């Protein structure tokens, strides 16, 4: 096309890649620090310090544990029929009613914490031949002596305590949780003074199961002016089953049932403040964002959260190797 020129000229083309003056060191299969152009952090390691109140229903227990709320300690009566996604228990919560212990407290705190509801329904139990509604000075309902708002302390009427034998069928289509208990007198005198008989007995049964407890007399440490204890127990009654409470002494009767739900509910011990904000992931240290795949804030979590890991930093290279000239 063109003609043979008497001049000859070349060009130079060089390929290359960028570099930044400031790379990030990242780990690989063969090296423990190799500097790349850029990386992302994959470990969430800091909390807001605040439990966001959205989207899950947080319920702050304030100075009530969930079991006190359940039982109906006077100072916890605020929680009656409450409902939660996450119940938060505070470290400063205290009990302040009759001294009780719950054999397998930890399972009770779990069954109601997962149920998510404290909805109580009163049932008409007729206690024939005993003095209902007893209370104590250790559990003041205002000026007066009182008791747990959901239990019924039964004492002898006149001069006798009959053998109580009552039934309450589960005619509804749902499971019913009944909370009940037994009083352990501090002295053998207290036993007879209260329940007439020298040894009470409580047998709570269903067609599926039975449990009989005998009280145990003896001095325990003074707690709120009392050296006696009551112990709490629970009976789930299935639809179509029947509950038969039977006792000739020391029964702390149930006033009805708690409904049981199945759902995403749980309890968390935390002193972090609830605050108004949206956050899917709750940690005792406050909410954390779940945009990263792993977190190092706390192994206790509730909700859509990153996987807890021991590493506190794990950087994913999002760039080539940094091989700079030097510059500034």
């Amino acid at each position: 096309q063109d003609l043979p020129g008497n001049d000859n000229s070349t060009a130079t083309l060089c390929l290359g890649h960028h570099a930044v003056p400031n790379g990030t060191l990242v780990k690989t299969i063969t090296d423990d620090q190799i500097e790349v152009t850029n990386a992302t952090e994959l470990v969430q390691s800091s909390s807001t310090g605040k439990i966001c109140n959205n989207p899950h229903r947080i319920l702050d227990g304030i100075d009530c544990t969930l079991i006190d709320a359940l039982l109906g300690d006077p100072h916890c009566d605020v929680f009656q029929n409450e409902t939660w996604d996450l119940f938060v228990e505070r470290s400063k919560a205290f009990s302040n009613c009759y001294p009780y212990d719950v054999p397998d407290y930890a399972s009770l705190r779990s069954l109601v914490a997962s149920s998510g509801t404290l909805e109580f329904i009163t049932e008409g139990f007729t206690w024939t031949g005993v003095t209902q509604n007893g209370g104590s000075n250790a559990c003041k309902r205002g000026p007066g002596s009182g008791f747990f708002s959901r239990l019924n302390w039964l004492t002898k009427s006149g001069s006798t305590y009959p053998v109580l034998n009552v039934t309450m069928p589960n005619n509804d289509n749902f499971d019913k949780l009944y909370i009940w208990g037994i009083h352990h007198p501090s002295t053998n005198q207290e036993q007879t003074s209260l329940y007439v008989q020298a040894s009470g007995r409580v047998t709570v049964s269903t067609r599926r199961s039975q449990q009989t407890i005998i009280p145990n007399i003896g001095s325990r440490p003074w707690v709120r002016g009392q050296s006696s204890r009551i112990s709490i127990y629970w009976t789930i009654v299935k639809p179509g089953d029947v509950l038969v409470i039977n006792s000739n002494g020391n029964l702390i009767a149930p006033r009805g049932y708690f409904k049981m739900r199945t759902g995403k509910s749980s309890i968390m011990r935390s002193d972090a403040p609830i605050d108004t904000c949206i956050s899917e992931c709750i940690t005792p240290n406050g909410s954390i964002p779940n945009d990263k795949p792993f977190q190092n804030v706390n192994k206790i979590t509730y909700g859509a959260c990153p996987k807890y890991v021991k590493q506190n930093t794990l950087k994913l290279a999002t760039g080539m190797r940094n091989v700079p000239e030097k510059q500034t």
Binding site: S9, A11, G16, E280, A304, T318, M320, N322
Partner: protein
């Protein structure tokens, strides 16, 4: 990297190349200059984002689990609760540690791969008219003005158009 282009035959990077990841500096008839290659920059970026999204893929949510803090000493059951959580944590920690290591290793070789792929693509295009200087630079053996450089970079360079010029200028043996 496995291909030996980045931190290999290409001695070092260009802190000056602020408009793309891979590119072309040239020196010619009009003078010296530089241009980013946007097609391999996108190819490297899309693969890195592909990786990223898959790691950042769905969080699993968990609700009521087991207790992980205890305030009294209980023995056999609590011992187990602690062993289950402890070994769960160690297994997930291993997993996160191996994941970013394989991931990072691959990012360094895939960006190395793209560098070498650009290079080879230019090599193939220039056909008999250029020689590899080794250092990631081709010596183009014919008059190549700024539109000529533009056609190499935009993938339209016709080698026939300058073959006889280049080929003569290339094999004229004399020193």
């Amino acid at each position: 990297g496995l291909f030996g282009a980045i931190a290999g035959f290409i001695e070092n990077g260009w802190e000056g190349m602020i408009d793309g990841w891979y590119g072309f500096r040239h020196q010619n008839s009009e003078g010296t200059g530089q241009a980013a290659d946007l097609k391999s920059t996108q190819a490297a970026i899309d693969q890195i984002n592909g990786k990223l999204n898959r790691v950042i893929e769905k969080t699993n949510e968990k609700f009521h689990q087991i207790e992980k803090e205890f305030s009294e000493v209980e023995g056999r059951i609590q011992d187990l609760e602690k062993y289950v959580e402890d070994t769960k944590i160690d297994l997930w920690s291993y997993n996160a540690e191996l994941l970013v290591a394989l991931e990072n290793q691959h990012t360094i070789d895939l960006t190395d791969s793209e560098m070498n792929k650009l290079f080879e693509k230019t090599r193939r295009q220039l056909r008999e008219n250029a020689e590899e200087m080794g250092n990631g630079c081709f010596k183009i053996y014919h008059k190549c003005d700024n539109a000529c450089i533009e056609s190499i970079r935009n993938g339209t360079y016709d080698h026939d158009v300058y073959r006889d010029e280049a080929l003569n200028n290339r094999f004229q043996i004399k020193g």
